[PDB]
Amino acid sequence: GRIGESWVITEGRRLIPEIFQWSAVLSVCLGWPGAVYFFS
Amino acid sequence: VHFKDGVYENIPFKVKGRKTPYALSHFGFFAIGFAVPFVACYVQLKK
Amino acid sequence: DVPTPYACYFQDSATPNQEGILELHDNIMFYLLVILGLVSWMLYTIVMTYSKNPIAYKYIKHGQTIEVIWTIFPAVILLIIAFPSFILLYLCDEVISPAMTIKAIGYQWYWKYEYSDFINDSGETVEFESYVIPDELLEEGQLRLLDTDTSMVVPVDTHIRFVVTAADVIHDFAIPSLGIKVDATPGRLNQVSALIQREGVFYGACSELCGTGHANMPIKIEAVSLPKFLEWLNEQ
Amino acid sequence: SPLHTVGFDARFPQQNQTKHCWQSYVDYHKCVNMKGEDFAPCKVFWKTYNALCPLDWIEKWDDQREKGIFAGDINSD
Amino acid sequence: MVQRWLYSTNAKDIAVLYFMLAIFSGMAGTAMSLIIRLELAAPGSQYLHGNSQLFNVLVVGHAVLMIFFLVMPALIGGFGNYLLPLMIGATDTAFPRINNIAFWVLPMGLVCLVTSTLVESGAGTGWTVYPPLSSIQAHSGPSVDLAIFALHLTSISSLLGAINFIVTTLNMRTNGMTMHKLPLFVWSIFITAFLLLLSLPVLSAGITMLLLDRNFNTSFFEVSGGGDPILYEHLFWFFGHPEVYILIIPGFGIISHVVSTYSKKPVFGEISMVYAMASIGLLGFLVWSHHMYIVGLDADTRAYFTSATMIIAIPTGIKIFSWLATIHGGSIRLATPMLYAIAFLFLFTMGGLTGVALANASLDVAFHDTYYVVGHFHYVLSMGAIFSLFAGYYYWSPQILGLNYNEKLAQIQFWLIFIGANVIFFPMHFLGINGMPRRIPDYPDAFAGWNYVASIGSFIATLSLFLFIYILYDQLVNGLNNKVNNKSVIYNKAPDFVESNTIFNLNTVKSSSIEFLLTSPPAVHSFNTPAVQS
Amino acid sequence: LLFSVGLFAVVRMAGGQDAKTMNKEWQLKSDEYLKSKNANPWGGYSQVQSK
Amino acid sequence: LFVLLTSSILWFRDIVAEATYLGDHTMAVRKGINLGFLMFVLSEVLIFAGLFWAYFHSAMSPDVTLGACWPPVGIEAVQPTELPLLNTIILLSSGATVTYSHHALIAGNRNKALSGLLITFWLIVIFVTCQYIEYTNAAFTISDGVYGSVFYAGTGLHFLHMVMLAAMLGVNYWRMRNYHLTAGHHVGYETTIIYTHVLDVIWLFLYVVFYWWGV
Amino acid sequence: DEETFEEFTARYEKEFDEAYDLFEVQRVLNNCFSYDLVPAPAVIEKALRAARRVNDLPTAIRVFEALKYKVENEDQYKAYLDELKDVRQELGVPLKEELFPS
Amino acid sequence: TIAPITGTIKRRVIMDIVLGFSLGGVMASYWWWGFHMDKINKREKFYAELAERKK
Ligand code: HEA
Ligand code: HEA
Ligand SMILES: [Cu+2]
């Protein structure tokens, strides 16, 4: 109820949505090492 | 001095004119956008 | 060491002060990266949640207790990151048992180095010249903007002071590997403490405007074995 | 110079050493050009004006004294 | 008919004219910076035959032009003379003659600086004019004198404008308005004007002293003759750092106004941070000397300077978190002001992070004059000034013209400048750690790929400027179409799930000032009645 | 982006050749000279940039 | 330069002529012009203070070489002292006698005001003549070898503000000759009341030192 | 400063006594839902009768779907379900059978 | 029909700040530890040649 539904997202923000944050910075690895490999 | 409604006259240019329908003055603005560095280079060196 | 294309790491440390300051800066930038990640996650979660926010709250103003909590958090954080900075600066600004001195008073658009600490044959000073190598003089065996007429030899495993000054315009004695850089006022005089630990070749430049020939004023130093260094100071 | 020639800096530990050579040279000149016999009292701080102080200023002062015209704001006595 | 554009007694014409002058200077600076980066695209002489003298001439032209004719005039003058006396309820601002004199002494500066840049000798010492680097022996001719005269006249213009703003705030306040609860923009302009009034005269005195040295051939700061140029170096620092505050704080006020009028919620700790900004303005005279750590000051002096420079750095994070709370719990719209403010705040967080990395004095020994310092201030100045001006324009164009601007063009413009800035500024970390040596016309070819990507980003910025001018043309030619259809944004803020269509139509804006619902700028006689507020 | 890359390509083509030295073999010789002695940091990685 | 100066003076006298002639004067215009003129004189005061501090800063002698201990003994150049002391002392006397003569004028506006204006004209003429006597061959030619020319340069640059003070007094007198500046929306009086009070303080600051110090 | 919240409620009822159009209903609903407080069934019924004083069924849809989606409140459903059921059965506003099957 | 309300302001910011700190710390620390162990092994090797120079 008040406690059971409180942890739906309170403790769920560490394993459910971290993929979004990880992919929000994934551009660096695909972009800059790719350019390094292309030029060198 | 107090006859400006303030809809299209606020700009310090005249919209009217067949020779310059905001086409000659703005092309001059285009020219002067890159004119000063080009002439600065041209005075001492080549472009 | 030597600048390299598409590098990913700082050059090898040449003095213990360099390694200490780089490690402390690494810890500082670790803290900076974690707080930047904090702020980035703040922004990301807030925008993602409120791109479809149903209700806009309006009556939360100060929260004085938690307000002063995040007001006193940065102060203690900066004090914590400054205590190692405090001890590092207190150790670095002092000179502990210096051994010898090398001086560099470069003229306009080129460098000049002085080795008055060592005697060439008997009493007389050691002094030489060093000028840039342009494209026309860039033959097979020289580097553009990285090779000078004469290299600068350094005594390995020896505490060395850098009594640096200028003549006409401020010239910047820059050796990134040694972690040394001081702008030399022509009328003033500045000295710093350092000592090279390993044997190697390092390149530098002038990171301070000189004039028309400011660019072609490189610094080319090197390190060799102690008998070889002593012999070089003997012959020159 | 095995990491120790003069020990800890005591003459002027600060990085800036602008007004450093003149004081290190005036006492030496006074002790030298007074009788020309004994220099023992002023025979301990040689490295102060030999390595810590640039030798260019020292040789410039020596040349100026030799030629009879000095550039520094000093006193004849 | 020409007295309106030559003897404008009204503030709005002067504001738009300053905007035009600043945008012209900015586009010229951007084009010539593109030329410079093309010269630095690859080592050697591909387009310019070496000429390091000419190289530093255009480098100093770059710096001086964008600092003195792009960021300064419009960003303060337009917003000040359009809001500060208008929102308070004053009928008309005083001192039209002073503003006209400032305008008409400006072309002296423009022409003199053009002649100074277009002589064979020229002045090319960069933004630093400390002798004997700025000596007449290398940079001969009249360039130094013309630059000094331009400095003097620009300082006079800015100081007189600040005086007019200050007297308007102090005297033209309406009866129904408390001083403690002034809006953040008013306090921002107040602090900026007072810091300018306490900073510009010192630099003006130093510049006059240098002019006397160059004319009468005296010995004050030359190394020969027992001079101390470090005095003028400290004067320039105590100008620039408060001048950095002058350039940034009005941007902070503009962002605060945007977020307050958009997010529909109050700014967290509004009065507390008004007091904090007052403290910043009072204490800015103590953190001006964190750049001279290597000149030869004492260790205790280094400790004092570093202690000050990281003890006055908390309010930056305080403002970051306050605006984060201001956008927290409310409604955020996919509008250009939102994204402009978000990008500006994020890149400012990275810039402040780099500055905090620079705050330490021990690390400065190996970090000063490296690439990291120039990368840091390019970060902070570039994003701050450029994004603040862009957000101000895209947030205020319907406020001063009433003709809607395309949403699609604005979004693609933002994306272009944003991607250009990111691709330019990301590799600077590697560039700093390697130690790219600054101000070299022919740098070592090791950084060739990074120079290539920097040139690509610069050219992206230039085509973005072309998009800017084309967007201006599109607005001028199709404002009526934008008003007719939905191709452009019609209302600043979207309604919430509480409002009926008619109610929102008759309650389109609930802001803190009448400017939003004030009709397109009326004649020179506006605000005929005082503003009453309770 | 396409306009950027195309205009850069055409302006580079119109610029013409402006480097009579520093070919690939020049860089190879310089890297071999630098990375043959004097306490090399694992032989370096100074690859030639491009054509 | 002379025709530019005449054009500027003509523009100033013209604009004060339209100010006195068009009328339409309220408290707004008078207060605004008075505040603006006070700001201008405050800027002039700040310029004076900056110029004074330009040569005042040599107190602790923080230099490095060729001096670093004022005075840098070793050079016997021309001493700038004792040349302008007559001018500064007669200016001190004039400032002392006009510290409240302007207020006496504004209170009375009678024949005593005419006498005050006449004596002011005579004293400023004496000042400009005693400045003009040493015009070219004052100390030497300013071409090379500078050791003590800083005081002379300071006096030369300070004389200019007195020059425009005399010019504004003359243009005010001619404006009264044109019958425009009466006891209404006064612009000359509203500034000349505080001109002496804002001038004497800074001149005493510049005279207590820079003449009794640095010799 | 954790100020009182019933003062704004009493302001809502005193404006209800001065209510003259649906505009005041919109204003009071926006002000009440803006606050962090969860409205009790009493004040919810007061808002509902204020909206029905002009007899505007779309306003009833607004208030009901706002109650369904006012505040996450750690994802409170069952209380919301029973509250919506009773505030529906008091008068009868069947609308969830239309927009949901879309 | 719950009467005691207005108790959600305190914990929202607390959970947000702790989650942000944890996520930023982990994200930074990954590459920080990787590049740090790279540097530490390189420095240990360099110390090995430094010792062997005098040995
Ligand atoms: C005001 C701060 C500022 C800003 C914004 C910039 C912006 C930029 N700077 Fe500069 N720079 C300095 C301050 C600044 N710089 C300083 C102090 C120096 C050192 C000076 C020296 O030592 O001489 C320097 C030096 C410097 C150098 C060193 C010169 C060298 O030796 O070769 C380089 C190198 O390329 C460079 C590049 C750039 C680039 C690519 C940008 C790009 O960010 C440019 C992008 C800018 C735009 C986006 C402008 C858009 C134009 C508009 C039309 C505006 C429209 C707005 C409205 C009116 C609505 N800068
Ligand atoms: C927009 C303007 C701006 C801003 C905001 C800053 C911000 C800062 N700057 Fe910088 N700076 C410049 C403009 C700016 N700077 C310019 C033009 C120069 C070049 C001048 C010259 O050297 O030539 C320069 C150079 C410069 C130097 C010169 C380096 C050297 O000596 O050569 C130093 C050195 O200390 C420095 C320090 C700082 C610091 C500590 C901050 C801090 O205030 C940053 C504040 C932000 C943070 C606080 C981070 C985000 C918030 C937090 C994570 C909160 C928690 C963290 C802490 C409280 C520890 N700056
Ligand atoms: Cu600072």
Residue E324's identity, in one-letter code, is: L
Q: Which among H32, C61, C53 has a CA at the least distance from the CA of E263?
A: C53
- Which pair of structure tokens corresponds to residue G124? 């400023």
Is C234:C121 a contact under the CB 8 Å cutoff?
A: yes
Expressed in angstroms and rounded, the spacing between residue E56 Cα and the centre of ligand 1 is: 14
- The torsion of the CA quartet C73, C75, C78, C80, rounded to 10 degrees, works out to -80
Question: How many Å apart are CA G80 and CA H2, to the nearest integer?
Answer: 73
Neighbours of E222 (CB within 10 A): 18
Contacts of C189 in chain G (CB under 8 A): 64
Q: Does A36 touch chain I (CB under 8 A)?
A: no
Q: Which among G24, G76, G85, G123 has a CA at the least distance from the CA of G210?
A: G85
Residue E163's identity, in one-letter code, is: I
All structural domains of chain E with their residue ranges: 3-506
- Please report, for residues B5, E18, E472, the alpha-carbon distance to residue B10 in angstroms, rounded to integers and kept in the order given: 9, 13, 15
Resolution in A: 3.3
- Helix (H) / strand (E) element for I5: namely none
- Please report, for residues B12, E8, E16, E50, G203, the alpha-carbon distance to residue E12 in angstroms, rounded to integers and kept in the order given: 11, 8, 6, 46, 41
Neighbours of E439 (CB within 10 A): 18
B21 backbone dihedrals φ, ψ, rounded to 5°: -80, 50
Nearest CA to ligand 1 atom 53: E27
Cβ neighbours for G72, distance < 8 A, ≥ 6 positions apart: D73, E226, G66, G147
Is E376:E244 a contact under the CB 8 Å cutoff?
A: no
Which ligand is closest to the CA of E297, given by its number? 2
Question: How many Å apart are CA G147 and CA E219, to the nearest integer?
Answer: 8
Catalytic residue status for E92: yes
Catalytic residue status for E290: yes
Is G207:G86 a contact under the CB 8 Å cutoff?
A: no
The Cα diameter of chain F in Å comes to 48
Q: Is the CB of E347 under 6 A from ligand 1?
A: no
Q: Which of E18, E82, E187, E245 is catalytic?
A: E245
Nearest CA to ligand 2 atom 12: E377
Question: How many Å apart are CA C132 and CA C144, to the nearest integer?
Answer: 9
Residues 97-156 of E with CB under 8 A from G: 97-98
The whole-angstrom distance between residue E376's C-alpha and the CA centroid of its chain comes to: 16
Catalytic residue status for E256: yes
Q: Which atom of ligand 1 is nearest to the CA of E27?
A: 53
Peptide bond into E73 cis (omega under 30): no
Is E232:E221 a contact under the CB 8 Å cutoff?
A: yes
Q: Which residue has the tokens 């709370």?
A: E325
Question: How many Å apart are CA E469 and CA E471, to the nearest integer?
Answer: 5
Q: Which among H25, H2, H22, H23 has a CA at the least distance from the CA of H12?
A: H25
* Chain F contact probe: residue of E38, E419, E453 with most F CBs at under 10 A: E38
Q: Does C159 show up as a binding residue in the annotation? A: no
Q: Which among E520, E365, E368 has a CA at the least distance from the CA of E438?
A: E368
Q: Which among C163, C183, C160 has a CA at the least distance from the CA of C171?
A: C183
Neighbours of B2 (CB within 10 A): 8
How do beta strands C100-104 and C152-154 pair? Answer: unpaired
Phi-psi region of G74 (alpha: psi -120 to 50; beta: other; left: phi over 0): left
Give C183's strand partners: C172
Which runs of consecutive H residues, i.e. helices, occur in chain C?
16-50, 64-92, 226-235
Q: Which among E333, E328, E257, E261 has a CA at the least distance from the CA of E508?
A: E261
Expressed in angstroms and rounded, the spacing between residue E235 Cα and the centre of ligand 3 is: 14
Is E116:E147 a contact under the CB 8 Å cutoff?
A: yes
Is D72:D61 a contact under the CB 8 Å cutoff?
A: yes
Catalytic residue status for E213: no
Which runs of consecutive H residues, i.e. helices, occur in E221-313?
230-263, 270-283, 299-311
Give C162's strand partners: C102
DSSP code string of H3-18:
--SHHHHHHHHHHHHT
Which runs of consecutive H residues, i.e. helices, occur in G72-149?
85-98, 101-108, 111-132
Tell me how many degrees the CA angle G73-G76-G77 measures, rounded to the nearest 5. 120
Phi-psi region of E178 (alpha: psi -120 to 50; beta: other; left: phi over 0): beta
- Please report, for residues C195, C232, E377, E437, F38, the alpha-carbon distance to residue E361 in angstroms, rounded to integers and kept in the order given: 20, 37, 17, 21, 33
Question: How many Å apart are CA E39 and CA B41, to the nearest integer?
Answer: 12
Nearest CA to ligand 1 atom 4: E382
Q: Which residue has the tokens 């903007």?
A: C145
- Which pair of structure tokens corresponds to residue B28? 């001059």
Size of interface C-G (CB pairs under 8 A): 7
Question: How many Å apart are CA E260 and CA E343, to the nearest integer?
Answer: 17
Nearest CA to ligand 2 atom 19: E377
Q: Does C208 show up as a binding residue in the annotation? A: yes
Secondary structure of residue C71 in the 3-state scheme:
helix
Choose the closest CB to C169 out of E133, E436, E497: E133
Method: cryo-EM
- D64 half-sphere exposure, CB direction, 13 A CA radius: 12
Tell me how many degrees the CA angle H99-I1-I2 measures, rounded to the nearest 5. 120
How do beta strands C100-104 and C193-196 pair? Answer: unpaired
Question: How many Å apart are CA G170 and CA B23, to the nearest integer?
Answer: 53
- Which pair of structure tokens corresponds to residue E131? 């002798």
Is C66:I9 a contact under the CB 8 Å cutoff?
A: no
Q: What share of chain H is helix, strand, coil (3-state, %, to 5)?
A: 65, 0, 35
Q: Which among E194, E169, E189 has a CA at the least distance from the CA of E283?
A: E194
Burial of G163 from C-beta contacts in 10 A (0-12 / 13-18 / 19+): middle
How close, in Å, is residue H76 to chain C by CA atoms? 15
Question: How many Å apart are CA A11 and CA G210, to the nearest integer?
Answer: 75
> Which protein residues are within 6 Å of ligand 2, measured from CB?
C 35, 74, 77-78; E 244, 248, 290-291, 293, 309-310, 313-314, 316-317, 320, 349, 352-353, 355-356, 358-359, 364, 368, 373, 376-377, 380-381, 384
Question: How many Å apart are CA C103 and CA C173, to the nearest integer?
Answer: 10
Secondary structure of residue G29 in the 3-state scheme:
helix
Give C180's strand partners: C175
Q: Which among G137, G193, G191, G134 has a CA at the least distance from the CA of G159?
A: G134
Choose the closest CB to H40 out of I1, I8, I9: I1
Is E370:C35 a contact under the CB 8 Å cutoff?
A: no
Our mutation pick for probing the ligand 2 site, out of E362, E376, E381, E386, counting the most ligand atoms within 8 A of Cβ, is E376
SS (H, E, C) chain B: CCCCCCCCCCCCCCCCCCCCCCCHHHHHHHHHHHHHHHHHHHHHCCC
Q: Which residue has the tokens 């004469």?
A: C150
Q: Which residue has the tokens 């944004």?
A: E489
Is E490:E59 a contact under the CB 8 Å cutoff?
A: no
Question: How many Å apart are CA C226 and CA E421, to the nearest integer?
Answer: 50
- Give the orientation angle of helix E96-117 with respect to helix E52-66, to 10 degrees: 170
DSSP code string of E309-326:
HHHS-HHHHHHHHHHHHH
How do beta strands C219-223 and C152-154 pair? Answer: parallel
Is C155:C145 a contact under the CB 8 Å cutoff?
A: no
Classify each residue of C202-216 as buried b or exposed e, where b means 16 or more C-beta atoms within 10 Å of its C-beta: bbbbbbbbbbbebbb
CATH number of the domain at C100-235, please?
A: 2.60.40.420
Burial of H99 from C-beta contacts in 10 A (0-12 / 13-18 / 19+): exposed
Secondary structure of residue C164 in the 3-state scheme:
strand
Is C24:E363 a contact under the CB 8 Å cutoff?
A: yes
- Which pair of structure tokens corresponds to residue G201? 């303080």
DSSP code string of G129-155:
HHHHSSSSSSS--TTS--SS-HHHHHH
How do beta strands C100-104 and C158-164 pair? Answer: parallel
- The torsion of the CA quartet B4, B7, B13, B15, rounded to 10 degrees, works out to -120
Is E200:E158 a contact under the CB 8 Å cutoff?
A: yes
Which ligand is closest to the CA of E461, given by its number? 1
- The torsion of the CA quartet C29, C35, C41, C43, rounded to 10 degrees, works out to -110
Q: Which among E336, E435, E381, E440 has a CA at the least distance from the CA of E39?
A: E440
Is E402:E449 a contact under the CB 8 Å cutoff?
A: no
Expressed in angstroms and rounded, the spacing between residue E254 Cα and the centre of ligand 3 is: 22
Q: Is the CB of E423 under 6 A from ligand 1?
A: no
The whole-angstrom distance between residue E502's C-alpha and the CA centroid of its chain comes to: 41
* Cβ–Cβ gap E460/F8 under 8 Å: no
Cβ neighbours for E108, distance < 8 A, ≥ 6 positions apart: E149, E150, E153
* Cβ–Cβ gap A39/F49 under 8 Å: yes
Cβ neighbours for H55, distance < 8 A, ≥ 6 positions apart: none
Nearest CA to ligand 1 atom 46: E30
Q: Which among G14, C155, G28 has a CA at the least distance from the CA of E171?
A: G28
Identify the sign of the CA torsion I45, I51, I52, I53: positive
Tell me how many degrees the CA angle C113-C115-C121 measures, rounded to the nearest 5. 135
Contacts of C57 in chain H (CB under 8 A): 34, 36
How do beta strands C171-175 and C180-184 pair? Answer: antiparallel
Give E116's strand partners: none
Give C160's strand partners: C100, C194
- B26 half-sphere exposure, CB direction, 13 A CA radius: 16
Expressed in angstroms and rounded, the spacing between residue E282 Cα and the centre of ligand 3 is: 13
- C36 half-sphere exposure, CB direction, 13 A CA radius: 22
Q: Which residue has the tokens 């620009």?
A: E154
Q: Which residue has the tokens 């277009």?
A: E118
Q: Is the CB of E248 under 6 A from ligand 1?
A: no
Which ligand is closest to the CA of E48, given by its number? 1
Cβ neighbours for C222, distance < 8 A, ≥ 6 positions apart: C151, C152, C153, C154, C200, C201, C202, F38
Question: How many Å apart are CA G149 and CA G144, to the nearest integer?
Answer: 10
Neighbours of E30 (CB within 10 A): 22
All structural domains of chain H with their residue ranges: 1-102
Q: Does D58 touch chain C (CB under 8 A)?
A: no
* Rounded CA Rg of chain A: 18
Identify the sign of the CA torsion G30, G32, G35, G37: negative
Q: What share of chain F is helix, strand, coil (3-state, %, to 5)?
A: 50, 0, 50
Is E482:F22 a contact under the CB 8 Å cutoff?
A: no
- Please report, for residues C37, H40, I8, the alpha-carbon distance to residue E329 in angstroms, rounded to integers and kept in the order given: 21, 22, 12
Q: Which residue has the tokens 């007429």?
A: C149
- Please report, for residues C48, F46, H34, H56, the alpha-carbon distance to residue H66 in angstroms, rounded to integers and kept in the order given: 21, 65, 11, 16
SS (H, E, C) E11-72: HHHHHHHHHHHHHHHHHHHHHHHHHHHHHCCCCCCCCCCCCHHHHHHHHHHHHHHHHHHHHH
Q: Which of E5, E47, E104, E127 is catalytic?
A: E127
Neighbours of D18 (CB within 10 A): 20
Query: Are C and I close enough to touch, i.e. 3+ CB pairs under 8 angstroms?
Result: yes
Chain D neighbours, 3+ Cβ pairs < 8 A: C, E, G
- Which pair of structure tokens corresponds to residue G120? 């002011």
Which ligand is closest to the CA of E312, given by its number? 2
Tell me how many degrees the CA angle G168-G170-G173 measures, rounded to the nearest 5. 110
Choose the closest CB to A39 out of E426, E427, E449: E449
Is G27:G185 a contact under the CB 8 Å cutoff?
A: no
Is G48:G202 a contact under the CB 8 Å cutoff?
A: yes
SS (H, E, C) chain D: CCCCCCCCCCCCCCCECHHHHHHHHHHHHHHHCCCCCCCCCCCCCHHHHHHHCCHHHHHHHHHHHHHCCCCCCCCCC
Expressed in angstroms and rounded, the spacing between residue E29 Cα and the centre of ligand 1 is: 8
Secondary structure of residue C176 in the 3-state scheme:
coil
Is E251:E381 a contact under the CB 8 Å cutoff?
A: no
Contacts of E47 in chain F (CB under 8 A): 15, 18
Chain B neighbours, 3+ Cβ pairs < 8 A: E
- Which pair of structure tokens corresponds to residue E190? 């107040």
Catalytic residue status for E188: no
Sheet holding C158-164, edge to edge: C100-104, C158-164, C193-196
Is E353:C32 a contact under the CB 8 Å cutoff?
A: yes
Residue C204's identity, in one-letter code, is: G
- Which pair of structure tokens corresponds to residue E129? 């004019």
Question: How many Å apart are CA E205 and CA E386, to the nearest integer?
Answer: 30
Expressed in angstroms and rounded, the spacing between residue E314 Cα and the centre of ligand 2 is: 11
Peptide bond into C134 cis (omega under 30): no
CATH number of the domain at E3-506, please?
A: 1.20.210.10
